[PDB]
Amino acid sequence: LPDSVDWREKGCVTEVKYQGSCGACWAFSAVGALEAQLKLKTGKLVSLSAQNLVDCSTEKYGNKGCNGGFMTTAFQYIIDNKGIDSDASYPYKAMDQKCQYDSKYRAATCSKYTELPYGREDVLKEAVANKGPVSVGVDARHPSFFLYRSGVYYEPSCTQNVNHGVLVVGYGDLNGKEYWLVKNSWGHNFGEEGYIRMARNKGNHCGIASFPSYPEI
Ligand SMILES: *C(=O)[C@H](CC)NC(=O)c1cccc(C(F)(F)F)c1Cl
């Protein structure tokens, strides 16, 4: 495998989004993974509707909108629904709303998803290198995560209990300190202009490899 990967270089990553006061990280993580696949399949880079997931991938999928949800069950919604709308057609409002999906604004489909085995950072590396960005959960329940500005993030109090959905868009090392390149949805002023580099091959740090998944179109 390559020593480093950055899917932004390959035209497969959209602008960083801002979730605001709504806990829709799971929805942003899901759409980000699918956006990359859509680019690979069709050649178009298009922001997909996180709001569509918040509003429509709800109780039937075990999700709770602005109170949290699962990337995997979001993918299954898109499969079952035979589509997800563009962000442009179904923009983000940072609140729970009635489902407004319309197939006339469909921007992508999903045929399946794959959940990687628990805790295996080598398998996660392979998927990022060979398949695309991968949706993951991390333990973000520590002040240092909120305060993060730059460099490789390591939090000695981190656990493998994940609570925040993000997107692994690459990996590498900073003067030998290995990291995962993570796209967050806390806007362009969080961390490294919306990104955080999290410790890699440090014992599944913050549960980054606990629950990884990726969709296919
Ligand atoms: C982040 O915006 C929201 C805040 C409620 N967090 C989640 O949706 C969430 C909560 C528990 C576990 C997960 C997991 F495992 F899917 F990552 C998530 Cl995304």
Write the layout of secondary structure elements.
Elements: E1 5-6, H1 25-42, H2 50-56, H3 71-81, E2 84-85, E3 106-108, E4 112-115, H4 121-130, E5 134-138, H5 143-147, E6 152-153, E7 164-174, E8 177-183, E9 195-199, E10 213-216
Parallel strand pairs: 6-9
Antiparallel strand pairs: 1-7, 2-3, 4-10, 5-7, 7-8, 8-9
The protein binds ligand O64.
Can you offer a commentary on this structure?
Strands 1, 5, 6, 7, 8 and 9 form a six-stranded mixed sheet that branches. This protein has one domain (1-217): Cysteine proteinases (Cathepsin B, Chain A, Alpha-Beta Complex), CATH 3.90.70. Strand 7 and strand 8 form a beta hairpin. It is built from five helices and ten strands, in the order E-H-H-H-E-E-E-H-E-H-E-E-E-E-E. Helix 1 (25-42) packs across helix 2 (50-56) and helix 1 packs across helix 3. By secondary structure, the chain is α+β, with helices and mostly antiparallel strands. It has helices at 25-42, 50-56, 71-81, 121-130, 143-147, and strands at 5-6, 84-85, 106-108, 112-115, 134-138, 152-153, 164-174, 177-183, 195-199, 213-216. Helices cover 24% and strands 21% of the residues. The structure holds ligand O64. It is classed as hydrolase/hydrolase inhibitor. The entry lists the keywords Cathepsin S, Hydrolase, Covalent inhibitor, aldehyde warhead, Ligand is covalently bound to Cys25, Lysosomeal protein, HYDROLASE-HYDROLASE INHIBITOR complex. It forms a monomeric assembly. Cathepsin S in complex with a covalent inhibitor with an aldehyde warhead. The protein is Cathepsin S. Organism: Homo sapiens.
